[PDB]
Subunit: 117 residues, 3 copies
């Protein structure tokens, strides 16, 4: 029963809890919309932030998604790359799905559109 | 038979190898006990520490679990959050299981009990 | 069909784009050869770097692997451990496979050979 990673990326303008939660929620909702993801099918999720964001764990946003309270999530620091995109939040959402690898819809929002291949 | 993540978190009082390994092992053992986990059913494990812990990789504790020598494990730095729990170690253990998402037993020990939902 | 993590580690001599990409590419190619891995069977990959590496994301090397353009990858920062191996890049490649846990071929190259059990 196949499992696949779904990637998301977005950015915030400021390091505040309000903006980190708002943008993270918007990113998750878009991933959910595009991939028709049900929470019970999510194995786990990893969220990362660049080391310029500190106000809150982006995973707190998952609680604002009804039905997602049992989805296991953890946060990590993104690698600090010289010249890399700043104030960036990324998601690796691992899901049970039969959608082929090439049709998985990865989501890039805000200033992270530049990360689109 | 699906793949699911199991979360664990704990804390240490000191940044010493002895305590990091002791608390990590205790956390792993509690997870294994509550979820009846066999090492062959573990896809992989991720361990994280806040950036105030430097004495040893928590993954070294896995060596102390009989039969877990082939479980793939890697470590990462936890996101540094203002006012966040200090000296915190987390686990994301990915397993094959029949247990429904809402019945998976996530484990929070020591000062990380405040993380429980 | 079970899922399994496949670990890789390697090192670079200096923090440059050329070295990071070359050594990461070499590590990935060796994992792929040893485990006969096809990109469609890869759930996702996580790459990490110790905090002395900033030149480029090692994930950029995945784009040099023909056919791997749809494999989801994200990078994270490795813990800073005292006496820990410096300038180190690690891979956790999650794949669907029947191969028993004890027969999975994990790969350690360059100065990271000291990590292998
Ligand atoms: O579950 C934990 O260990 C938490 O500290 C909570 C939480 C979350 O808000 O969901 C935040 C940060 C951790 O990296 C993972 C999850
Ligand atoms: O095999 C490696 O990559 C190691 O360096 C060893 C080890 C471990 O203690 O098991 C320690 C740190 C790494 O993040 C992952 C695993």
């Amino acid at each position: 029963m196949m499992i696949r990673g779904i990637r998301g990326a977005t950015t915030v303008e400021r390091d505040t809890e309000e903006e980190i939660l708002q943008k993270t929620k918007q990113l998750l909702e878009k991933i959910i919309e595009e991939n028709h993801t049900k929470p019970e099918d999510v194995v786990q999720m990893l969220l990362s932030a660049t080391p310029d964001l500190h106000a809150v764990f982006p995973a707190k946003a998952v609680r604002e998604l009804s039905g997602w309270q049992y989805v296991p999530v953890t946060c990590m620091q993104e690698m600090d790359v010289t010249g890399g995109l700043k104030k960036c939040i990324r998601v690796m959402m691992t899901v049970q799905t039969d959608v082929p690898q090439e049709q998985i819809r990865h989501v890039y929002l805000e200033k992270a559109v530049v990360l689109r291949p």
